[PDB]
Design a protein around this ligand. Structure first.
Ligand SMILES: Nc1nc2ccccc2c(=O)[nH]1
Ligand SMILES: Nc1nc2ccccc2c(=O)[nH]1
Ligand SMILES: [Zn+2]
Ligand SMILES: [Zn+2]
Lengths: 366, 366
């Protein structure tokens, strides 16, 4: 088990399928990472998360640095033993969440805990180290949407300076540099020239993987794909491409077609508790009266435990009754559905029939 | 597998240990029945409930007749397939919940859904049949606490008339009378003569088991035990004795010492989500700051999955963060703890050392 090794086993167009080997395990790509906000993938035990097929989960730094605190989790042995997940864990830098859920300067960002806090590239990298993150994300400044070329450039340029600092901060910490990986984050809003600048600077600094940031800011899928079309090719081909905050089945398939290898999004979990269930025939709102006496499983083909044991009628009842089990069952199904999606994606690419799979997927889902 | 067969395998004082054989399974007594309010044991999958050691669960008729409706559940195949629990299920008559969570008459009770509804002995028995209940409880009128001798007598006498009606309603339904069992409920508040009257009337009508009702109404454990001391002996010795709504470790041990064979209470589940965890050293509130960095499991001896994988510090974090997993883990532990309690009880009685076990239990728990 090497610190980090990305191998591409097959391609079709811009799409790629392969593996990322790390000390804590192998990550099959394209990969979908279930999101674990506060040291938990909402409503699911780690074993359940793994059982659905996930090889890696995403840990939210923002919430953890606040509660229960990075230093504390390190004192308890790290995020891995703390939450009972022994496989790889990717941690975001926290800057994003801060700018969403404040005084900003070239040194970093200061904010009030919804207490006062300072978060810089150095502190971000240290927090992720304290948590014991396997894939560390560089600390960046997200660019609001819409953004003017000038503003986008300033932010992108600041992010690149911050990327260099993240890099050095990471390399300066022996244990971290030797057991974990560092991903740089491309910015530049929807402007091609900025994206190119960011890509080259990122490549110039050198990272283990490259993320495409600033694309989950309210733009439509059409604009996102347009941006991906010219952005992903700018990134080093032999390293993973990670589309941050992007999920939603059809979004994922389109991004893979454009070269993305990694995904994360709260939709599976959040929508689940909200009553939305993903199926190959598109999403459905289980709370709708039409499911009150529907004995069929959430999805007719899904092989997840939920679809094997319970009906839509029962889950319909639980969600409308505000029952915790409803949240558990919906979330397990959705995450299982997402992993199943990724598996079909990896298989179709390995078999040189991903294009057909994508077409067939869209035809039925919509 | 007979319809109903209670066998006592061992005794020590008033305590008894044995089994109740029913079509859907064997129930080891003394037994604790996890409570499933709205067709679910809050925060737990049926397999998990079973894994903790439960042989039977209690289904709340009240909530089910309202949502999703008895007729509907019968249409979907019954409570068993609806919730994924194929073992025995005991259903309360619903009258209690109505008088708690309204126009009362000799024919029954009318109430407003917190819609208008009528619930009589006949309707109660039919609802439980529609749900597919294995152990049907007679429809009774609970006696408020405190209650005067006159009022207690009127209510007890009405309950006895209602017990006869429940009996006939049950026997008049072929499929139900042949596959399920019927338990009568003793009333009479804290008055010995009324309890005796109720017991004889109940015995006169004849039931498969006898419950001691009206004892979870705010009286202290001292008064409850006093009542149990003279009440339980009045009930037929060769049939199960069920103390309704009574849980809380020390309450259970004391009631077994006084001849009770069956228990149910929401404390395990409700307290769990509230942050209270039961241990052999007494209950603890996991939210307390003293557990923020406690790496030990909820309880040092518990063999439940939660205590094998997660620390008090993690569960402390989840509960304070309002995380669903916290509710899941706390509830699994508590129910597992309750089942472990019952096992130690059954074993000590089988081994003629229940008295010592009770003494040792109290010494440490308190
Ligand atoms: N740090 C960071 N995190 C993100 C998460 C989702 C979408 C976008 C981003 C982004 O641009 N930067
Ligand atoms: N039907 C019924 N249910 C109960 C539940 C808990 C305690 C007491 C009672 C009782 O007396 N009757
Ligand atoms: Zn499913
Ligand atoms: Zn435990």
């Amino acid at each position: 088990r090497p610190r980090f090794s990305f191998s591409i086993a097959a391609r079709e167009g811009k799409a790629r399928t392969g593996t990322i080997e790390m000390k804590r395990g192998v990550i099959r790509t394209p990969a979908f990472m279930p999101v674990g906000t506060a040291a938990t993938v909402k409503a699911l035990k780690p074993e359940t998360v793994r059982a659905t097929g996930a090889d890696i989960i995403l840990g939210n730094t923002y919430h953890l640095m606040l509660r229960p605190g990075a230093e504390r989790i390190a004192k308890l042995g790290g995020l891995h033993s703390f939450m009972g997940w022994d496989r790889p864990i990717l941690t975001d830098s926290g800057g994003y969440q801060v700018m969403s859920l404040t005084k900003q300067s070239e040194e970093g960002v200061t904010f009030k805990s919804h207490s006062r806090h300072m978060l810089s590239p150095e502190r971000s990298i240290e927090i992720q180290h304290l948590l014991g993150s396997d894939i560390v994300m560089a600390f960046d400044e997200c660019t609001p949407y819409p953004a003017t070329p000038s503003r986008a450039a300033s932010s992108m340029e600041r992010s690149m300076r911050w990327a260099k600092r993240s890099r050095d901060a990471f390399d300066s910490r022996k244990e971290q540099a030797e057991n974990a990986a560092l991903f740089g984050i491309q910015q530049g809003s929807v402007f091609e020239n900025l994206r190119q600048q960011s890509a080259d600077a990122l490549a110039e600094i050198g990272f283990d993987g490259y993320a495409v940031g600033g694309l989950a800011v309210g733009e439509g899928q059409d604009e996102m794909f347009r941006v991906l079309d010219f952005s992903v090719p700018m990134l080093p081909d032999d390293k993973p491409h990670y589309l941050m905050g992007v999920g939603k089945p059809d979004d994922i398939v389109g991004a893979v077609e454009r070269g993305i290898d990694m995904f994360d999004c709260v939709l599976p979990t959040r929508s689940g508790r909200n009553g939305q269930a993903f199926t190959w025939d598109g999403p459905i709102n289980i709370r709708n009266a039409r499911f009150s006496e529907d004995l069929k499983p959430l999805d007719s083909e899904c092989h997840c435990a939920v679809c094997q044991k319970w009906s839509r009628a029962y889950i319909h009842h639980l969600i409308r009754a505000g029952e915790i089990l409803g949240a558990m069952l919906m979330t397990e199904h959705n995450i299982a559905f997402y992993q199943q999606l990724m598996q079909k994606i990896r298989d179709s690419i390995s078999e040189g029939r991903f294009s057909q799979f994508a077409q067939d997927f869209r035809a039925r889902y919509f």
